[PDB]
């Protein structure tokens, strides 16, 4: 009777994973992150979390940072101090002894690599690069005085050559990093353990386990719009590798999807709206970067993209958000296919130059006028709004399990309980 | 659904080759999901490196998933190798998202090792750095040229300034490798669509790991590991299929442990028992000629492998090698600085201090190479096999009493 749930955005972020994650967190017994670094979820139990999973506020819930993450131990301690200063207990935290460690040379490397390009702040990329190269320092290494110093000496030998000779800049001595960072590790040691054992024990004993993806599917390093992606795998498959659990133990995957598409980046965007409709969707949907203030690009729901997400991330359940934003639009469109070089295709091209030539083939649906912001069940939707929601499910092949008609908690309507099998 | 993953549970040489050859006969699709052109067991002898095992059967679709790194020149050599021997390859499919190994990756590989080699590591590093060139880029004249220009602008600084050595001009690589792409184009497609189609229509699909679980970049003896994830979870990421579509995972274990590297090896035997196992088991590198280290079965390692690779089925191999050893041992825990533990330490300095705590079982004396059923095994050999399964938590699905195919005894059908 396995009871695990993965929650992930199906698009390029800003899908509203936050509200759904908060909900599923309440009913979880264990909550785990499985990839990424100190990237941010904004809750008021006002709190913002970066590395620590969202179950931390509940004393009884075990929170796991899996082996798939890269951890800045300094930033992690800042995040812990932040919680403690707000009266939040963190004894429920578990940190993987196999997670990789972000060190000061990763931050400098990050800056230097970014400034050399003409086409990335916290050293996450460089940490993942060291992992692939097999020179990375792991949490277990940081906890060993002799091993930490030795790997630090070996890596700085190479990193300092890179800084001094390729980038004409100062490197780091071993003593600028060693005692400072060893001490950080000592403060984290109480949480460090075999997290694969922790998770498998919880899973095998039928506990409710929630895995939280940090970025959206289209930002996946393998399956997203590479290279404008994150440096890891937020797809549900990433859970298996990122925490060390078998694929048979990941039961349900909730894909969080918005009723329309949004993008922050500048890449190809088949269903983009440049007109008054996109203006209305943007204004009503408040599609502006919360920290940057920059407007997001908006466009129609793209079911080619979402079916792609269903395949690569094994989506089983759909949470459809921001449905209210489409009110008062007489003709709604959903992209069902792409016209490319004169051919009709149903795949997301891996080549962005090909993605850029893709014109959407769309279904038109009639819109509605009623304020659906008060709606609390499918039966309360006006006919055209329900038919729109049903069509999204039908087109994507994913069963509806939640829909949202506003930003509030009570405006998330549960159609199906994803913890029960 | 009817999908199987086959993976070595140890550090290679478990004998997954026999097991893969058997499962690929009943498979309709065979797929690779990680690694590069750095594998292969003999299968008229054939050695495959990048191309999955099903290629010899015209009607079986063979897939190289998005999780691999592909040296296009090497792949064409492998294709030619097969064609020269009458083997059709129309059944091959290559991910349009697989990453491409280029000549600068090979030089970088050499330079990096000399500082402390098929460019597999450097190609995974470039993937992580998001500057990698993918199969879809290689097929695009303008894209390839542009990405090559950008990358060589950085790689040439690395080479000239850090390694005081020559780099590559764009033209040294462009025309040669674009040509290679044009020869591979016919096979290139969305392999996630291909596999999900095969899976949804109930076809038998086999995924084969390239290295053992203890060489996994996350879960193995880091840093002495491969540069990707041969664990069964690697299938989800490496081919773009959901966890729910990976139904059975066969862990291939040898009845005792072997290692090639010189790192920690808790159950290592240095005595006459080690000598007997090495000789009877032919525990030498087939290419290097070098003797492998051998030791008792280690269930601490295999329980770790069960967790991290979601093993559902056990293939136990080379059981006949343990014949004639009166007292057989299985390690079930480690004593580590006076503490008794049952996890594999993530830190190698700690693993190096692990002393085995062992169960002991009586051996057998009879030749078992002709045995074709659990019921025909001598008592103490059946007991040993059963105990391995009891201690690791993995049900027995195959066992082997010799190198030949007919000495692979099937207990359950993993495709059912
Ligand atoms: Cl080894």
Task: Give a summary of the structure in a few sentences.
Chain A: It is found in: Cytoplasm. 2 copies of one chain form a homodimer. Chain A is an alpha/beta fold.
Topology:
The structure is a homodimer.
Chain A (H helix, E strand, L loop, with lengths): L3 E6 L7 H11 L2 E4 L7 E3 L3 E3 L12 E4 L4 E2 L1 H12 L8 E4 L3 E2 L2 H13 L7 H10 L5 H4 L2 H22 L11 H11 L3 E2 L1 H10 L4 E4 L24 H7 L8 E7 L1 E4 L12 H10 L11 E6 H11 L3 E5 L9 E10 L2 E3 L6 H4 L3 E8 L16 H14 L2 E6 L7 E3 L7
Parallel strand pairs in A: 1-10, 1-11, 2-5, 2-10, 5-7, 6-8, 7-9, 11-14, 13-15, 14-18
Antiparallel strand pairs in A: 3-4, 12-13, 15-16, 15-17, 18-19
The structure holds chloride ion.
The site of chloride ion has 4 residues of chain B, from loops.
Cofactor (chain A): Mg(2+)
Enzyme class (chain A): ligase
Main location (chain A): cytoplasm
Structure description:
The structure is a homodimer. Chain A is of the alpha/beta class. The first copy, chain A, has helices at residues 17-27, 73-84, 104-116, 124-133, 139-142, 145-166, 178-188, 195-204, 237-243, 276-285, 303-313, 352-355, 383-396, and strands at 4-9, 30-33, 41-43, 47-49, 62-65, 70-71, 93-96, 100-101, 192-193, 209-212, 252-258, 260-263, 297-302, 317-321, 331-340, 343-345, 359-366, 399-404, 412-414. Chain A folds into three domains: 1-96 and 192-256, Adenylosuccinate Synthetase, subunit A, domain 1 (Adenylosuccinate Synthetase, Chain A, domain 1, 3-Layer(aba) Sandwich); 97-191, Adenylosuccinate Synthetase, subunit A, domain 2 (Orthogonal Bundle), CATH 1.10.300.10; 257-421, Adenylosuccinate Synthetase, subunit A, domain 3 (Adenylosuccinate Synthetase, Chain A, domain 3), CATH 3.90.170.10. Helices cover 33% and strands 20% of the residues of chain A. In chain A, the strands form four sheets. A ten-stranded mixed β-sheet of chain A has the order 9-7-5-2-10-1-11-14-18-19, sandwiched between helices. In chain A, helix 3 (104-116) packs across helix 4. The first copy, chain A, is globular, with a radius of gyration of 22 Å. Chain A starts with a strand and ends in a 7-residue tail after the last strand. Chains A and B meet through helix 4, helix 5, helix 6, helix 8 and helix 9 of A and helix 4, helix 5, helix 6, helix 8 and helix 9 of B. The structure holds chloride ion (CL). The site of chloride ion has 4 residues of chain B, from loops. Chloride ion (CL) is lined by residues 11, 259-261 of chain B. Chain B: It is an enzyme of class 6 (ligase). Chain B: Belongs to the adenylosuccinate synthetase family. Chain B: Mg(2+) binds at residues 13, 40.
